[PDB]
Amino acid sequence: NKRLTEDERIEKELNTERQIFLEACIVRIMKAKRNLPHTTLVNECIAQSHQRFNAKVSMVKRAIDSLIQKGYLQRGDDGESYAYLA
Amino acid sequence: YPKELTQVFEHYINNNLFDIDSLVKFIEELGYNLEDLATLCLAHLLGYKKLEEPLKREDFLSTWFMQGCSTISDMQECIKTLDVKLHEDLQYFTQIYNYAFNLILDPNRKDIDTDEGIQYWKLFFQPEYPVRMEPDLLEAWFRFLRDEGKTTISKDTWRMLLLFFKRYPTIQKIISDYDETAAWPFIIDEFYECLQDQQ
Description:
heterodimer, A: mainly alpha, Arc Repressor Mutant, subunit A, 3-stranded antiparallel beta sheet, 3 helices, 62% helix, 12% strand, B: mainly alpha, Recoverin, domain 1, 64% helix, elongated
């Protein structure tokens, strides 16, 4: 069997390395800011990631979704901010 | 507790436990089915955390007594009342909608299966309820999920979808206004880019 083409495996590795980087970036920011509007987090994450690569919003949002699933972040009651969860 | 009330509990209990079969017999006697939205109202009222977890005698009795009910007719009237409120009251509806996720989530899981979600979504988002939206958008959402292999739904997504449909009634208010850089769950961004494809 084979789920993945060779080109698909390479695309998968690329994304995973971006996502792993953006997830740690986001946790770093939130650990220090504790509470943040969505807009401000996304902007900050892109600015701090710029050293490494050009993070697209869609990539940052995927990272955010993973951190919520993992229990690192809680969406605020307003539905457009996040709180860090230790 | 009034004798009448304790006797209701005793009548439906299965071998020392008010279990899922007790609950099924109970709500069916009142005229409803386990899968009804009205059952969610009942469960929420009685403090259920999981549909299949037994209800403790004390929780059964105290809840009903507090609501001024001591007979099965009192109980039927109370749930009718909550059912009407679910139809009419957006705040309660929202509360019951949010409650629904955890109640139907398998205790050993973090997410629900997409099929189960659609099952409840088909009921929640009908026009007889406080959230008014076009049937096409709802069906499109179901199709998006099936077509794109979205087989589980998280609590954040479950919760945010309500807000999404609250603000976006049509497949076309979305085009006119949806912003994919805002804070919507990314699964909804994906749905957004399928919706613009089609038109």
